[PDB]
Each structure stands twice: as C-alpha cells, then as structure tokens.
Amino acid sequence: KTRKESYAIYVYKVLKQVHPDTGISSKAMSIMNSFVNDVFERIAGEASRLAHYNKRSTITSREIQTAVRLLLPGELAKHAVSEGTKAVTKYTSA
Amino acid sequence: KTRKESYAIYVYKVLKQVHPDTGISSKAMSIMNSFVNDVFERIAGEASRLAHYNKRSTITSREIQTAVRLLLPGELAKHAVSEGTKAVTKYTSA
Amino acid sequence: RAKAKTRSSRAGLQFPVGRVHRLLRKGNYAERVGAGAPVYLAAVLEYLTAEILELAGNAARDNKKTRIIPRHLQLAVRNDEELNKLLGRVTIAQGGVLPNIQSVLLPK
Amino acid sequence: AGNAARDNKKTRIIPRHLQLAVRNDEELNKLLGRVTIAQGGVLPNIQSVLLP
Amino acid sequence: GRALLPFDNLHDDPCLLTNRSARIPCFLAGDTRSSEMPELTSMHTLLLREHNRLATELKSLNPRWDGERLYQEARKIVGAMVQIITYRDYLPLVLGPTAMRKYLPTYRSYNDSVDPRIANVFTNAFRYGHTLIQPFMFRLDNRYQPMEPNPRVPLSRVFFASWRVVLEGGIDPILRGLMATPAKLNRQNQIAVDEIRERLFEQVMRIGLDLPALNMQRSRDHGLPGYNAWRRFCGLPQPETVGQLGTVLRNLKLARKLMEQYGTPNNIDIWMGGVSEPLKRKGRVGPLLACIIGTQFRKLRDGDRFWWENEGVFSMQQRQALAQISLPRIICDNTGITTVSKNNIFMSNSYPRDFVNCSTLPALNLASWRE
Amino acid sequence: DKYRTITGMCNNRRSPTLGASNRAFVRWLPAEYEDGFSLPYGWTPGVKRNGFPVALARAVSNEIVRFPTDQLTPDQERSLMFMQWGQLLDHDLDFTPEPA
Amino acid sequence: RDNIQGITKPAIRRLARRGGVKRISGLIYEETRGVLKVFLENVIRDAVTYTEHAKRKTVTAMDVVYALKRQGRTLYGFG
Amino acid sequence: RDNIQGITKPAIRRLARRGGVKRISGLIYEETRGVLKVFLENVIRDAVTYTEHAKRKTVTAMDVVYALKRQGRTLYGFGG
Amino acid sequence: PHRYRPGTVALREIRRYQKSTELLIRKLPFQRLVREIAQDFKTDLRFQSSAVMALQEASEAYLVALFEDTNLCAIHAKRVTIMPKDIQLARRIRGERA
Amino acid sequence: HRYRPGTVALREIRRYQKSTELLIRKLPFQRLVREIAQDFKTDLRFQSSAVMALQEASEAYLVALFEDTNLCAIHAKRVTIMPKDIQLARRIRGER
DNA sequence: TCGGATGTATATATCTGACACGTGCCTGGAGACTAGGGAGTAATCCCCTTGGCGGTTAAAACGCGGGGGACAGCGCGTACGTGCGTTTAAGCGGTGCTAGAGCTGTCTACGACCAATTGAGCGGCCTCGGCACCGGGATTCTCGA
DNA sequence: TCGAGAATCCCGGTGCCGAGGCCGCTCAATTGGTCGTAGACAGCTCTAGCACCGCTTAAACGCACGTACGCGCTGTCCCCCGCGTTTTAACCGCCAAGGGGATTACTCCCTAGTCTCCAGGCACGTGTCAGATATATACATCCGA
Ligand code: HEM
C-alpha cells in the first residue's frame, strides 16, 4: 500500500495524559488532526513572513515566539510562550 | 546609498503606452507599486500552494494559470489568461 | 557572445521578466521555477496595471486634470465591479469615498 | 472536550463535545472564529424577546 | 474535385465585363456582394463546403434523418460556428482588452427588452476595415512560396474577377495567401491606399471610384450627425478649437488639416473622426469607434434568442463540442491545405514560425448529436 | 420555434417584426438634413452648415487620406484574415439597397 | 433539472429553527434558495478548478476542503 | 492624559457626514470614541510587536502596514 | 380537542434542533442539486461521497449562521417575523451582496 | 434668514464626500496614538509616516462603520443613528 | 411661485515646488556549458463510483380554522440642527540637539550535508464493551375552566 | 389556582460494530564528522525624531430657539401557525460493471549551478510648467410672501 502520517498517536498520548479514562472517536480524531495541521501552518507561515521582513535566511525560536504572540489571542498566547520556552531550555541542557 | 528597487519605470512605460500625455504623481506611483507587489504575492502564493497540493516541486505556467483563474474575478481572469498565454507562445518562438 | 537582449523584449512586454524570475526564485515559493512562469506572471501584472491605469486616466480626464492622483485611482477602482471585487479589502490613501446618498434622506 | 463529555455522561469524545469546548471558551472561540467543525451543531441560545 | 459556388444569372453581370475571353459569370450566394474579390468568394466557398461536409457527416451519423432535418441541423451548427469564431477571436482583436471588457461583459441570459436592430451609424462605423486593405492580392503554393504565374496581382485587376477563382488554381492559394500575409497598419498619415482610392472598380465602371469619398458621401446621404455629436453620445469629451482637437487626436498637423477642411469639429464626418483617432492599446479602432462597435455587438448578442450559449438552443455536451471549433481546423479540413496557422488565425502572419500541420489539433466531435 | 426563421421574424415576443429583415434602421441620434427632413448636406450650393461651408468629400479625401504608397507600413500582429473576416461579418450584418 | 426545489420548505424551516428563528415569513424560501445556489456555485466552481488542475475526473473531498479554505471557511473533519 | 477627547464632536460629525449620515444622536460620540480606541489598540499592539522583533526603538511605517495587513486591512500608499 | 397556542411548538422546535447535531436537509435532493450545479462547469464529473458530505456540512453551517444574523436584523426593527429585507441587510453588512 | 433642519446636513454630506483630506486634527490624533502606545513599550519613537498611516486606516474604518450604521438605522425606519445601530453593525460584521 | 439672500461653480492672473529628463556607475541579468534528478509516458490493478431493483414508512403536500403580529394613522414632547459670539489651541515657520538607524568589517559557531544503523510508527488483524435502539413509567409544562 | 393531556425525561434489556490493543516491517529519525557561510558583535556616520517658541487665525465651544422626528398608543386584517389526512419519494439492503485513481519503471528534457561580461536601472542634479492660491462674477438653489 502506502504510508499516511498523521498526528493521531500523539493526540492519543496527550489525551491519556489529561483524561486517562476517556476515549475518542474517529471523527473527533480527524477534527483534532485538522486542527493541529491548521495551527502548524498558521504559525510557520507567520514565522516565515517575519524572517523575510528582516532579511534573515533562518527560522529561529525568536521568529516562532513572535509568531505565537501575534497569532494566539489573549492569555492563551502568554501561556503558550511559557511552554515553548521551557522546552527549548530542557532541550538545550540535555 | 543602498539601491531601492521598485516597479516605477515599468508602470510609467505602461502609462505612456495607454495615455501618452498624462502624468502621474508620487503618491499614485506608491499606490501602483503597492498594488503590483500585492498582486504578485497573491498569485505566487496561490501557485506555490497548488504545487504543494499535487506533490510537485516546480512552479510552471500551468500553476500560474490556475492561480490566475482562482484569484482574479470573472471576465478579468479570462482576459488575463489570454494575455499570459499570448506572451509565453511568443517567448517560445524567439 | 551575442548582444544581450532582455527576456521581456522577446516576449514583447514592458514589465521585467528577469526581475520577476529572481523574485520567484528568492521568495521561497517552490524548489524549482519553470522557464515560462516569469513570462506569464509579467504578462498578467502588465495587463492589470494597464487596465487600472487606463481607468484612472479616463477618470482624471473627466475631471479636466492632467496628472493622476490617488483620488482618480480610487474612482477608477470603485466604479468597476471586477476591480472592486479584486480590491474589496484594500484601502487607498487619500482616496476618499464614492459619492452616494440614500434615497430616504432626500427631501420629498 | 473531556470535561464536556463527562458532563454529558459519556466516555468517548465526539465532535459535539469539541464544538461545545471551543464555543464556550472566549480565547479558543476567537482563535477558531472562522472554522466549521463537522457534526458539531450549535450553542443553545434563544433571544429573550422571543420567550413568552 | 471540390465544390464551388453555384452560378448566377443577371441582366448586367460585371464578372463577364471584367474579362470577355474567359466568360465566367458572377457566383450566387446569400449576398449579392459575394464576388467583389476572390477572397470573399473563397470564404463563401469554404463556408458552403463546411455546411455540405457537416450535412454528409450528420447523414452518416444519423441515417434515419430527413433532408430537411439535416439542413436545419447543419444550419444551426454553422450559425453557432460563425458566432463562436467572431465573438471569441475577432472582436477582442478589434476592440482590445479594455473596450471588449467594458462593452461586452460576461454573457448572462437572453433579454427580450433589448433591440437587436442594426443602427444607422454602424453601417458607417464598421468601415474601419477599409484602412486595413493591402494594395495587392497574394497567392501562395503548397510550400507557402510565391505561386506562379502572377504571385502578386494589383487590387485594381481583381475586382469582380470571378474567373480568377475557377481558372486560376481555385481557392487554396487565396486562403494560403490570406493566412500568411500581414495586414496594413492604420497610421494617422497613412489612412487608405491609392488602389481603392483612385482605381476602385476601374474596369467595370467608366471611371475609378474613391472609397473614402464614397464613405463620407454616404454618411452625408444617411443624414448622420457630426463627430462631436457622437463624441457626446458615447461620453467622450467634445473638442471645440484647434488645440482641443489636437489634444484629442494626439496630432497637430492632422487637426490643422481637419479644421482647414471642415472649419469646426462639429462638422467632421463620423468615418473621418473614427479613423483619424489614435488606436486603442492592442486594438485597431479609436475610442469612439470602439464604443459604437461594442454597443452594437452587445445588442446583437443580448437580443438574439437563438444565441449559441442560450439555454435550450444546444445541449451541454453540444456546447462543449462546439467550444472547441477553430478557423484553421475548418480551413485545413474542407480543402487541400495541410499547413495552417495556430491559436488566433487573425494574429499569425509569418511562415513558418507560427504554423502547424493541423494533424495535431482536434476536430469537431459530432458524437453528441445522436438522437 | 426549434430553428431560426429565414427572415428573422417573430424573434422578439414583444415586437415580432423588430430585428427582422427589410425594415428601417434604428437611429441612435436624430438625423440632420440641410432642409430638416430629407435633403442631404451639399445638395444646394451656398448653404452653410452651422455657419461653415460644406466641404467636398472628394477634396477631403484628396488632402487628408491621400499618402504616397511607397511608405506603406505592414501590421506586425495581424493577417489578412482579419480584414476578410471583418468584411464577411459585415456582409452578414447589414446591407443598404439603393434604386437601380 | 429543477433540483433547487428539492430543498423543501420544511427543510428551510428546520435550518431556521436551529438558528433561533421563531416566526417565519412566507417569502424567505425563494430568497434562501437563491442564497444557497450562489454559495454552492462559488464553492463548486473553485473545487472543479482544483480538480481540473490535477488532471482528474473525480472531485475529491480535499478539493472541496481547499475551495472552502480559500474563501475563509475552513472546515474541520474531512482531512 | 485624557487625549481620547482630542477626537472632538465636530470631527466625529464630519466622519459621519462622509459616510452619508444625515441626523446623529447625542450618545454616538462616546460609542465612536470607544470603537476607535479599540481599533487603535489592536493595530498599535501588533505594530509594536513587529518593531520589538526587529530590535528597534522607532515604529516605522512598514510595521504599521504589516500590522494592518495582518487584520485584513491592506493599506496602499505607505511603504511597499 | 387539544390545541397549542402559536409559538409554543415553534419554541419546542427551536430547543430540539439546537440540541441535535444531525443534518437538516435530505441527502439525495442535495446530491442531485450539487451534481446539476457542477454540470455547468464540467461534463461527466464524478463525486466522492465525502465531497458531497463536506459540501452539505458547509452549506448547512453557512445557512444557520446567516439565519442567526437575519434574526438579529429582524429583532432590531421591533419584529418577530423574518422577512427577506433582513436577509438582504445581513448579507450587505457581512460584505457579500455589498 | 434660516435654513430648515436637514438642509445644511445634506450640504455637508455633499461637501465631505467630494474631498479626500483627513477629517481629524493631526496633533490630537498623534497624542492619542502616543498615549495608546505608552501601554506597550516605554520611550517609543514614531516615524511621521507611521502616524499618518494610522490616521488613514482609522478614518477609513470609521467611515465604513458609519455607512453600515446608516444602513442599520434606515432598516428600522429611522433617520438618526443611535448606538444600537453601531452595535448591530459591529456584531453582524463579526467584531462583537 | 416671483423676488431676495446665500452658497458654489467659473473664468482670469501669480507663483512655486515637484515631476520629468540627463548623466555617471555598478551590479544584477544574459550568454555559454555541464550534470542529474523531476516528471512525463506507458502498463497493470483493484476499488469505489454509478446504475438498478424492491419494500417499508417517514417525511413532504395540502387544506382549514383562527389569533396575534404587521402596518398604518395620530398626537406629543423633547432633543438635535442652525446661527452667533467668544475662547483656544492647531498649524506654520524657524532653531537646536542627539538618539539610533543604517552601513562596514571581522570572525566563529551553527546549520546543511553526507553515510551507516535501527526502532518508531503505520498497516493489517481481532475482539469486546460503549452506545444506539427498544420498551415502559415518571415528571413537567401547557392551556382551558 | 387546578386538572386533563401531550411531550420530554429517565431508567432497565439487547445486540453490534467501531475503538483499542497486538505483531511485522520498513523507512525516516538518530549519531558521528566536515565545511562554509549567515549572523553576531563593535565602530562610525549622519538622518530624522523630539523639544521649544511666537503668531495668526481657523476650529472648537457654549448658548438660545424652534421644529421635526422618535415613540407610545389604538385599530384592523391578513397571514402565518398548529393539526389532521393523504401522497410521495427518501432510505436501506443487495448486485453487477467498469471507469479511473494509484503504483512501478524508465528514460528524456529541463532546470540549477558557475564564470564573464556588459547594459539596464538606480541615485543625484536641474529647471519649467501643472496646479494651488486670490478675486471678482454668474448662476443655482432654498425659504418665504
Ligand atoms: C478589401 C476590399 C473591399 C472593397 C473593394 C470594398 C468595397 C466596398 C464598396 C465599393 C462599398 C460601397 C461604398 C458605399 O456606397 O458605401 C462597400 C460597402 C461597405 N463595406 Fe466594403 N469593401 C472592402 C472591404 C471591406 C471591409 C474589410 C469592411 C469591414 C471590416 C467593409 C465594410 C463595408 C461596409 C460597412 C459597407 C457599407 C454597406 C452598405 O452601406 O450597404 N468593406 N464596400
């Protein structure tokens, strides 16, 4: 056949982290996969625009942080920033 | 001083083609420059999306033609398509 | 080496095919760009520019002027259905508005 | 979405619960403002003038 | 072995008067002017051959059909073909993109509140083609080379010379010459050639005619208004003095000559003002002629109840089949020419840079005509 | 009404005779005549049009249209099929008869 | 084929009830049919353009999703 | 620092006249001031974010143009 | 016999159809309409089932949102009935028929 | 001498629909922009073009909003615009 | 419903600053040549779309009675438009300073790019319990007395 | 308020099909070096943003009337709702063909990548002529007698 990658196992892992006794149907998983793809596309496109405006050839964590602050609304954005920052710290130490 | 590229001489040449005795101010030239940049970016982005959808890695004149068909409204699109074709054929003959 | 002739001259255009090709290559649109895509884009851009400039020049002439100002560009764009649909979410600086008044407010 | 499913006495998450979760949250509703969720329905809301 | 137009009998036939030795009379078609030059006769013969071939293929396609049904169906096909070719290839090359888009927007539906009658001014505003006439008739062989004898003939000797069609190799060289010869560019100092100005119908008539002078005289006879009246009618600014006329025409010598001959822009004839204006961008007429012609053709299209795009005239599959027709396909399908021009036949005039073999372009798929 | 009528009759329901053949032209502007009804301009010598003499059409053709043939400029983007199709379409549209 | 009448009056009433409408005038059914026809024409034209570019003869769900997304009407649930 | 009152009543009345409004109620002015403040806050916040990413201290016209284009309010004439 | 006053069953229907998530248009008529519309653009077109399902979902969402805006427009003019002028005003302000 | 109510209003409507200038004084608008930007970053500078672009965008937005408000007011069989019309126009547009 | 007051478009001089050319320089586009991977044809393959048939029944159509909203007319009173006089900062110039934007130079460390290895994730296969129907009673809301 | 009647809600069985967990592979993701350029500093110039002042004078601000419009308040009538009966076609289940999306494989044209070379397109400088600015005049319009 062929291979079709998707964000299904990772969404299920997060769901088991949050609601260990709750499952999810197939239509809801399709919706979640579409949501993840849409948000990825939005953030990556905004970051690419930011890099192009300043005449940079590289997408860095600064571009991603500014894209998150521009796109995500309200306190949501703030929280997201924290999460992202923590990852890039824990990754750099290890 | 760093050179600043713009679509000014070409817009002036087209204006002299259409209205040989009509001039244009500086604000109007800025507006026309912004218009040209906006339309270029719209068509190029749509063509890039079309190439990515069909798992191709080349932007050809078919992608540009379909982007013009999708973006430009009604009769405009038709005429634009004609003009575009009229160029490529000529470019191939020479 | 023969005398260099521009690509836009071979296609019979005024807009630059070479600059458009460079902008397509440097703009991070696709990995490769065909030979005929810049010609098509330049032709389409020149067509749109000529259309809007013709309408704006007519609007300026109707006003007994010689030079095009943003007011004439706004009058050209807003009086044309296709161009108004293309530029629906666009603001033109120092353009003003199209003169209209609702029939209800006029004296009867 | 899991909280919405639990309040409905259901174990699995269906698109209705995702719609209820998104639409009842201000930030998420503003983020997904121009997005349609399939088989999601709408939020129960009747204008007060229509009520008897 | 290919069909020709049926002959006609008349009390005074100019075709015989052109050459007594040959003794070929004028042809017969739907119009009495079908034999002024061999090129018009060639186009008429091509249309007749196309109708006959369509009728034959419809009879083979549908053998139960009667002759009247075949005739009516081929008549509808040829009418739709002419409409498609005209409104898709000819008018954009006359008006240009801006005028064509302004005066001929997207078709919507039939509209009975539109008057499809031909206006009086149109008969004088459609004579712009008198400025595109070359002073010679060109004929080419199968290799698009000058055909002998007489590769190029003066236009004064081809008027009503129907014998040049029957006895001079047929219509193939004439069509080949038409397809691969550039037209004449209308310039403000080169309006019309002397062949049609001093030698028009030289042999038939006692003295040569003057086509431009005939145009102005006929405009006067019909009682048409002046140049400024039409400028006001179409919505363009109306000049009054020499300077305003020079601004409108973008020329000072021509404005001075027009003023010294007429005395006021209100008196300039419609043909003079129409052909003295600077041409549109990618068009072959000025703003006033473009306005008149676009208005007339928009009225003709929107007022015709049998328009090929109207619902019910043709089936959907029939529409898709018809939308793929072309003049080169008809030209290389109904006679012996194999190499034809590509894309817009009205634009390709260089051999062999823009020619094809027409063994590649598709034909008309009649399979949707099954009853 | 499956096919067209040869004369083009009854194409418009409101006015069946409108658009048919052998009828008068449509005047987009009122006609002007040197007498007001049917006399063409230049019929009677000495009659000025709007305070100006009526020019001889042959004279206008002589001074304005006439140009030496040897500097004819061919069209770089059109063929003679342009002229031929224009003439054929015109012979489709209109034809004004005159008495023999 | 007059299939626009296949969208019946009770179906429009149900769609209005989901929207919170209590009383309905009798002239909004033709208006709703016209609105729906316009919307469907736009979306289907874009979807068929996307299909024709790929040299296919089948309109897939991805074509509809892209046609909706390019009009600012993103739809989640069909890929 | 109450500069929101710098948008005077005659200015709002002129803006309404350009929009074709014939009669204006008395409470329109406070509502218009609130609407304008909301719009300006959104646009200026986006522009300042764009400026800060570039490690600059002046808010250039291009930052404003990009901030407007983000909201779907493309502006022609300033910048490119 | 029993009878409900006008507006009671209407409110019951409003409460019932705002709680469900099903599709409110019959599937076969909508599929036929979609095919007839697509007939103009291209001939002999085939549709996946998912394509028609997506079109139906999008159309129903659009119509429900439009009816919400229309109800707001009707209530603005001190009415309860929903008239075509409300639909026209909502579509003008939204930017569609403007 | 005195004009009837609504006459000078129509004259002003015709006058301000022909001009292209800006209808808000520049200095108060610049002060307002600086005050608003004070809440995001401290000691900020502005190009003159930045303030001019902000003014153009704001004026265009307000004029379009007032057109929609006038339509909403006329819908309710009225001639004056009230805050409820502004709220309805904004809510239908999606801003609230 | 003809004459008076006000507002606005029009034709005629003055002056100025901004647009349209001219000139010098440099760097980005054109002309060659070569290498290799993307894509254009072909040849299977199976899958999923279309077309048909028959039965059950749920929903669309139609008709009727009535009541409750839509729309028109009529005061009434108040709040917004129009003038008019007074206050007040806006706009325009000119002067002066310095912050920071933009360019140049150097250099270093970070990301692209290979090759080799292996395990994470995807497809196919089972299987059992969460949910969708069934029935019934229970509780609630509505509307005529 | 109170009772009869629909309508909706809440419980107990009963299957059943889709969600969740297990193997088998294979194809990206990881690990380990190399290399070359993009970006991170520092200096340094000089542009333009900020500040301050004085003066017209056009704008804004109060204030006083009056009238036209927003807003309740009847009153009629007609049009939409609720309900019952009949008619229609949607829906479900099952069969049968075949068009046409997907995979392989196999080259071939076409595009990227590198030097050399110039012309095209910038920046900078200059001058003159559209157009903005006064000024008086001629209509066009509005309100009232
Ligand atoms: C090329 C050689 C042509 C010749 C020799 C020719 C000759 C003539 C002559 C002699 C007349 C009658 C003059 C008069 O009384 O008006 C005429 C009429 C006319 N021609 Fe041509 N013509 C030619 C081409 C064309 C073309 C190319 C067009 C249009 C594209 C055209 C359009 C007309 C029209 C509109 C009339 C008026 C018909 C009428 O009023 O009855 N002609 N032609």
Numbering used by the authors:
A (entry chain H), B (entry chain D): 28 to 121
C (entry chain C): 11 to 118
D (entry chain G): 66 to 117
E (entry chain L): 207 to 577
F (entry chain K): 5 to 104
G (entry chain B): 23 to 101
H (entry chain F): 23 to 102
I (entry chain A): 38 to 135
Paper passage:
Here we show how myeloperoxidase (MPO), a highly expressed neutrophil protein, disassembles nucleosomes, thereby facilitating NET formation, yet also binds stably to NETs extracellularly. We describe how the oligomeric status of MPO governs both outcomes. MPO dimers interact with nucleosomal DNA using one protomer and concurrently dock into the nucleosome acidic patch with the other protomer. On the other hand, MPO monomers stably interact with the nucleosome acidic patch without making concomitant DNA contacts, explaining how monomeric MPO binds to and licences NETs to confer hypohalous acid production in the extracellular space.
To further determine the role of disulfide-stabilized dimers for the ability of MPO to evict nucleosomes, we chemically reduced the single disulfide bridge between monomers in native MPO dimers, which efficiently dissociated the particles into stable MPO monomers that were still able to bind to nucleosomes. In cryo-EM, we observed nucleosomes bound by either one or two MPO monomers or by one MPO monomer and one MPO dimer through the same acidic patch interface as in the non-reduced MPO. We used the reduced, monomeric MPO in our GATC cleavage assay. Notably, under conditions in which non-reduced, dimeric MPO efficiently allowed DpnII cleavage of nucleosomal DNA, reduced monomeric MPO did not promote cleavage. Only at a 16-fold excess of reduced MPO did we observe faint bands corresponding to the cleavage product. This is a further indication that dimers are required for the ability of MPO to displace nucleosomal DNA and disassemble the nucleosome.
